[PDB]
Structure formats: structure tokens, C-alpha cells
Design a protein around this ligand. Structure first.
Ligand SMILES: Nc1ncnc2c1ncn2[C@@H]1O[C@H](COP(=O)(O)OP(=O)(O)OP(=O)(O)O)[C@@H](O)[C@H]1O
Ligand SMILES: Nc1ncnc2c1ncn2[C@@H]1O[C@H](COP(=O)(O)OP(=O)(O)OP(=O)(O)O)[C@@H](O)[C@H]1O
Ligand SMILES: Nc1ncnc2c1ncn2[C@@H]1O[C@H](COP(=O)(O)OP(=O)(O)O)[C@@H](O)[C@H]1O
Ligand SMILES: [Mg+2]
Ligand SMILES: [Mg+2]
Lengths: 534, 125
């Protein structure tokens, strides 16, 4: 026994994970606390390694270091995954072998009284003959893995080691590396919650409070509730950014105004710096991104008719259904209409109004020149990230362009289609929800490919089909005068109008390039030339 | 005993006679494959319209057999794989199945393993 019966994890660095320690200690390290006499009388062996997995930057290395410290072990021998890899034949095995030399030597000399040596891996999934199954070429000359196993067990036995593996992709771990006698205790370190964020923020700001540098205006609960899906490292980044911004503001103000030494000595950070840094500096990876919405809804939403309200209300109903419901944790929907009807903007608005913590948009604008396998990898990565949050929402921008559909042929990619069909019918882990929104202009082709049988609902986005609707749209936009509007109404009362909003904006912009006299006739000619008749 | 509770998500309610017929046929097939001597290999195919409840009944039939080896091969654990990887995975499952004295294997959604699409048609040979 070297640690108190209930252990202690607080104000020692790691602050967010206090239940994890108890779980792991109960499950794995019960032999090293009991009096050695009884353990030797029973005749049992200790666990020879554990595995940790979770999102990056959530405090895994700290846990391993503290576990090593609490067991009275020597200095950990850190190592990285990609670092142990070399193209020369029979060189990675050497790197794997050099790590255990000290343990072997001490076992040889001291016999059965040596201490404890702990090896901490990192990105252990890099060396594995399972990533090769996925489309690619990372065979890593399988031999490597075998060598590692031959050192954890085999004919020659080592009884004074402990291997802690850490990974982010728990689905690429070789299955032979989890049998009894090897790494045989798995654990999860997920994102923090309100209390965890509060504790982390309290810990990381303890220095200033001692020296009265921090202002009395700032709270810590407000900043704990404002940050929704922040991880451990982003809070430290936020604190550093606040420090830098406050310092820069203070120096600039002192230079601008010859303030007395009373305030010059003071370097209070206040709360404005924290809010400014939070809203401008840090961009979470597992949270909402308010910058990208303005890249799709460029001119907002204007109500020119009833259909817009219908679509928005149906979206609200779907969001409410997915939020609070059991027996149905996955919901899908599809928006369909003719080209230039404004489907992407409406989808973005529906997603934004949901107030979910995790919102993402998967569009083909960021996949130029990609092979189909890379597209599959990106889609799967987006969905994998979505699966690590309590409430999520994913938008697929264009389903026809993701498949590479061309009417001649026809031609398309089958791998992406099958991946989408599989992913649309896979529920998240227990206790979590999801929502998916589609978008397309060719419903018939999707129906012919048996893809409309996977979605759960469908919505229709119509165009402008009456003169008064066009007049109302122009009035809301505000680009034509009074007599101009009278002339437009007189010439468009015929009611033979069928246009899309995007095309309407383009036509107005083109028509407004002449002197005020000839605008009306040019606009009317352009509109008339587009005389569609469904 | 985690796959069965993951595939039968809402139990099995009896809304009519057909359920009993399906379960009885499954039981008879299981008894045949257990008690026979000149027919060690048996197969069966469950078909019907979409959204009819094919996977739940198959999982229930497999679970109610009490065989010491049971495995399910679904396509949702092979996202992004190529043809060779699928072949290797299926062959590995069957090879493991061959080392026991009593086994049962479930193959799910045969039409998604071949990558069928009515246009073309296209699939994996
Ligand atoms: N009521 C509205 N509904 C939709 N878009 C609107 C509305 N009012 C204004 N807009 C603007 O019209 C444009 C809509 O174009 P959008 O990108 O949504 O078209 P689309 O249907 O996706 O086109 P494409 O066929 O090129 O994919 C955006 O600028 C949007 O801001
Ligand atoms: N008597 C029943 N038979 C089948 N499923 C039932 C029954 N009672 C309840 N259920 C539930 O209904 C759902 C049936 O969906 P299931 O996954 O079996 O569909 P499926 O036939 O595989 O569909 P798909 O055509 O989409 O592949 C499951 O939740 C199952 O638990
Ligand atoms: N639970 C936590 N409590 C306090 N700080 C944390 C916590 N988790 C992560 N950190 C901070 O994150 C950084 C270290 O991240 P690290 O432990 O390497 O995580 P990972 O191995 O997942 O990247 C340090 O700034 C550390 O203070
Ligand atoms: Mg679009
Ligand atoms: Mg099925």
C-alpha cells in the first residue's frame, strides 16, 4: 500500500476527471493496494497494461502521468506512434525493441524485487495491420506489431512493466492486442460538462487571483455556461488570449493617454477582454461555427409568400420531434425543388434556428479534385465527429454533385452512393440523437436509385408563380420607384411569370447597369425572354 | 449477448398469426440441423417487403437456438471497404465458425453486400 484507500484527485492538475480514477483503480489496480503477503499467498498476477481512447485534447496524458506517479514508478518513457516507423527493412522492430532494455537489465540484476517501469505510448493505432483494410496502402509491414507482442509476453517473461496505450480511433486497433495477458482494460475520456468546465477554468486562473491581477468584474460561472462544447485545451487557449488582449489594450491606452502611475501599475484584465477573445479568438472544433452561416445566407430571408412559413414550421416540428423523443433517435428529411429556388439558404436557416450544440455543413465546395475514396473518408469523418455529442445536426449540401452524376451515360460513383445509403440508416451510440437534412434538384434520379426509400420525409420549395408575388418581392427588396412599379405591374399583370429568387436578383442587378430612363424596358425584355411554361 | 439486444430494439410483439408460423419454422430448422447425420449443412432465406421486420426475427431465431457459437455479419461495420476486404472479413468469420462443434451464422442484407443498384445494373462479382 502506497496510496490512501480512496486516493485523491483535485487541485493537482487534472481536475475534470474525478470519477474516472475510481473506476480504473477499482477495475485494474486492486492487486497493488492489498498487503503483499496476502497477494503472494493467493498467487495471482497483475494487469500488464491498459488502453485509453477519446477525442483529442481532453486530458489523457495527464491521467497517465498521475497514474504513474501514484504507483511509485520510475520516470515514464514517452514515445510517439508515427515516430517509430522507417522504410529500411528491419528497422522499426529495432525501435520497438530498444524500449524494454532497462526493464530486462533490472530484472536480471535485482531478481524479483525491482521497481515499476511504465511505458506511455501515443497514437498506438499508427502501427496496425487493420487500417490497410480501408481503401489505401498503410500495410506497415505487419511484422512490427508481432515484435511488440513478443515483448509483452512469450517464452521469456517480464514481470515489472506496465504499458499504457492511448488512441483516438478505437476501431483501427488490432484485435490480437486485446486478449487476456495483454492490454485488457479499456476506458473512455469524453468531453467535459458544465461542472468540468467550471473546475478547469477555476484551476487555470488561480495564478492571477493570488496577485490581484484579475479584475473583480469577471465571473467564472458565466464563462462556464457560455462555453458549450469546449474541450480542455481550448479553455487554456482562451485564458492566454484574454491575457494577451488585455495587455495589448492596456499598453495602447497608456500610450494614448498619459494616465497617472496609479492605473499604470494596475494591469487588470476586466471582463470585456474575455468576451472579445471568446467571440473572436477561439474557434471550437466540436462546436458551432457562426462564421460559415454568413457564407451561405448572404442576403437573408425575405417573406414573399406563404410557402416560406410552411417550410420553416415543418422544420421546427422536425427539430422538436428529434429533440425530445424515445423509440426514434435518428431522423432525416429532404428538400427538393427546381434550380435557383433557394434551398441551401433555407436549410442553413432551419439548422441555425435549432440551437443545437453541434452544427456542421458537408458541401462539395471543399472537395475539388478529390477521388471518391477521399470523399468517403471525409464524409465518414464528419459523421464520426457528429457521433461524439449529445445533440447533433448535419447538412448535406448537394447530393447530385457528391455522386458525380452526368445525364450522358448515365455515370456516377457507386462507392459514395453505397456509403451514403449505409450511413443514413445507422443509429448513434446509446442515449444520443441525430438529425440530417438533404438538398437536391433532381428528385426523379434519386427515386430511380432507391435512395428516396431511406429518408423519412420530404419538403417542396416552389418558385414565384404570380404577378403580385413578384411585386411584393420587389417591394421588400426595394429597388424600383413608384411610377416604375406602376409600369412593371401594368406590364406583368399578364400573369405569365415563373422565375427563381436567385435569377431574379441577377436580373435586377443586370438591369440596374443603365441610365434611369431605359431600366424598365431592359428589365421587362429580360423577364419576357425567360418565359417558362411548366 | 449484446448484439441481440442491439438488433431487437423494441422487442417482439405478436400482432397476428404469421409471427408464430415464422418462429415455428425456425425452430424446426434448428432441430433438424442439430439432430441430423446425413445433412450437416443447412441454409434458409427470409424475404419480404421493405420495413417488414426481417432482421429482428432472424436475430430472435438465432438467439433462441442455444448454440455455443453465434455471429452476425452486417454491412454497417464495413463502411468504405473494398471488395477484397469484404471477402477477407467474411472468410475470417466462417473460418472461425468452422472450429466449433455447433455454430450458427447470420448474413444480413445480402443486397447491400453485392453493391446492387438498379441502374446498370452494377454490383460486385
Ligand atoms: N426567401 C428566400 N429564400 C431563399 N433564398 C433567399 C430568400 N430571399 C433571399 N434569398 C437569397 O437568395 C439566394 C438563394 O440562393 P441559393 O444558394 O440558396 O440557391 P440554390 O437553390 O442552392 O441554387 P443552386 O441550384 O445553384 O444550388 C441567397 O442569396 C439567399 O440569401
Ligand atoms: N413482431 C415484430 N416483428 C418485427 N419487428 C418488430 C416486431 N415488434 C416490434 N418490432 C420492432 O420493429 C422494428 C423492425 O425493424 P427491422 O430492423 O427489423 O426492419 P427490417 O425488416 O430489417 O427493415 P429494412 O427493410 O429497412 O432492412 C424493430 O425495432 C423491431 O424491434
Ligand atoms: N481535465 C483537465 N484538467 C485540466 N487541464 C486539462 C485537462 N485536460 C486537458 N487539460 C489541459 O490540456 C493540456 C494537455 O492536454 P493532454 O493532457 O495532452 O491531452 P491529450 O493527450 O488528449 O492531447 C494542458 O494544457 C492541460 O492543462
Ligand atoms: Mg444548392
Ligand atoms: Mg435489415
Amino acid at each position: 500500500s502506497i496510496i490512501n484507500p480512496d486516493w485523491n484527485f483535485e487541485k493537482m492538475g487534472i481536475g475534470g476527471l474525478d470519477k474516472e480514477f475510481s473506476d480504473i483503480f477499482r477495475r485494474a489496480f486492486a492487486s497493488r493496494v492489498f498487503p503483499p503477503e496476502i497477494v503472494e499467498q493467493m498467487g495471482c498476477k497483475h494487469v500488464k497494461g491498459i488502453l485509453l481512447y477519446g477525442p483529442p485534447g481532453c486530458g489523457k496524458t495527464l491521467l497517465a502521468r498521475q497514474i504513474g506517479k501514484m504507483l511509485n514508478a520510475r520516470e515514464p518513457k514517452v514515445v510517439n506512434g508515427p515516430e517509430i516507423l522507417n522504410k529500411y527493412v528491419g528497422e522499426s522492430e529495432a525501435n520497438i525493441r530498444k524500449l524494454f532494455a532497462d526493464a530486462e537489465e533490472e530484472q536480471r540484476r535485482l531478481g524479483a524485487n525491482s521497481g515499476l517501469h511504465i511505458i506511455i505510448f501515443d497514437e498506438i493505432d499508427a502501427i496496425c495491420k487493420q487500417r490497410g483494410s480501408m481503401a489505401g496502402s498503410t500495410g506497415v509491414h505487419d511484422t512490427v506489431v508481432n515484435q511488440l507482442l513478443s515483448k509483452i509476453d512469450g517464452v521469456e517473461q517480464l514481470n515489472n512493466i506496465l504499458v499504457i496505450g492511448m488512441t483516438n480511433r478505437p476501431d483501427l486497433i488490432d484485435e490480437a492486442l486485446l486478449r487476456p495477458g495483454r492490454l485488457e482494460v479499456k476506458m473512455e475520456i469524453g468531453l467535459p460538462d458544465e461542472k468540468g468546465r467550471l473546475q478547469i477554468l477555476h484551476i487555470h486562473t488561480a495564478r492571477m487571483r493570488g496577485h490581484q491581477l484579475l479584475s473583480a468584474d469577471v465571473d467564472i460561472k458565466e464563462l462556464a455556461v457560455e462555453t458549450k462544447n469546449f474541450s480542455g485545451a481550448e479553455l487554456e487557449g482562451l485564458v492566454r488570449a484574454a491575457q494577451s488582449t488585455a495587455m495589448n489594450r492596456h499598453i495602447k491606452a497608456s500610450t494614448k493617454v498619459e494616465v497617472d502611475m496609479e492605473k499604470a501599475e494596475s494591469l487588470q484584465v476586466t471582463r470585456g477582454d474575455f468576451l472579445a477573445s471568446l467571440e473572436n479568438d477561439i474557434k471550437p472544433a466540436f462546436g458551432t461555427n457562426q462564421e460559415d452561416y454568413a457564407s451561405y445566407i448572404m442576403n437573408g430571408i425575405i417573406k414573399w409568400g406563404d410557402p416560406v412559413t410552411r417550410v420553416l414550421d415543418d422544420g421546427e416540428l422536425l427539430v422538436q420531434q428529434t429533440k425530445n423523443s424515445d423509440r426514434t433517435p435518428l431522423v432525416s428529411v429532404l428538400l427538393e425543388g427546381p434550380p435557383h429556388s433557394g434551398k441551401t439558404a433555407l436549410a442553413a436557416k432551419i439548422a441555425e434556428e435549432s440551437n443545437f450544440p453541434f452544427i456542421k455543413i458537408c458541401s462539395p465546395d471543399k472537395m475539388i479534385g478529390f477521388s471518391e475514396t477521399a470523399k468517403c473518408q471525409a464524409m465518414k469523418k464528419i459523421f464520426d465527429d457528429a457521433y461524439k455529442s449529445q445533440l447533433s445536426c448535419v447538412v448535406v449540401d448537394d447530393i447530385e454533385r457528391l455522386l458525380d452524376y452526368v445525364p450522358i451515360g448515365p455515370r456516377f460513383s457507386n462507392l459514395v452512393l453505397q456509403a451514403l445509403l449505409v450511413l443514413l440508416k445507422k443509429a448513434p451510440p446509446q442515449g444520443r440523437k441525430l438529425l440530417i437534412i438533404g438538398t437536391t434538384s433532381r428528385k426523379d434520379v434519386l427515386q430511380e436509385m432507391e435512395m428516396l426509400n431511406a429518408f423519412s420525409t420530404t419538403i417542396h420549395v416552389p418558385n414565384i408563380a404570380t404577378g403580385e408575388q413578384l411585386l411584393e418581392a420587389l417591394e421588400l427588396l426595394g429597388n424600383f420607384k413608384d411610377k416604375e412599379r406602376t409600369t412593371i405591374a401594368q406590364q406583368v399583370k399578364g400573369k405569365k411569370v415563373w422565375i427563381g429568387i436567385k435569377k431574379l436578383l441577377m436580373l435586377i442587378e443586370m438591369s440596374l447597369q443603365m441610365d434611369p430612363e431605359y431600366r424598365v424596358r431592359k428589365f421587362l425584355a429580360l423577364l419576357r425572354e425567360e418565359g417558362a411554361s411548366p
